[PDB]
Amino acid sequence: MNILLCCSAGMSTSLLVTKMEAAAKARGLEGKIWAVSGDAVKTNIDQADVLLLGPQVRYMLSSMKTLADERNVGIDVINPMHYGMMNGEAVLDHALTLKKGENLYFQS
């Protein structure tokens, strides 16, 4: 489960990535969880299974969605409460939900 976060690797987002990594390890989940600035998404999206945007870059969703949909990568904006309260277990769940729903047997 590879989870790409956009669009900054500042204190807050990086703290969340660390918490998301602790949560994934504690479910013996292998994969890469990493944050990049917006200019790096194109070169990192193919490795990702899910792309998650910080609440402060919600305005980039429409444009990032076109790319993600095209690449078969789940995409969503992180819930402001999960982000502000640094709930890594919750954001990992969000990502897992996007990936699972995305492969849903009935259609797409």
Q: Which of residues 42-101 bind Cl ion (CB under 5 A)?
A: none
Instruction: Please report whether residue 8 would count as binding Cl ion according to CB under 5 A.
Output: yes
Q: Which is nearer to Cl ion, 91 or 96 (CB)?
A: 91
Which range, of 8-16, 44-52, 53-61, 84-92, touches Cl ion by CB under 5 A? 8-16
The answer to whether the CB of 89 falls within 8 A of the CB of 23 is yes
Comparing CA positions, the residue from 64, 66, 68 lying closest to residue 50 is 68
Residue 6 among the catalytic residues = no
Closest separation in Å from C-beta 106 to Cl ion = 39
Length of the chain: 108
Question: Which of the residues are catalytic?
Answer: 7
User: Where do contacts with Cl ion occur on this chain (CB under 5 A)?
Assistant: 8-9, 37
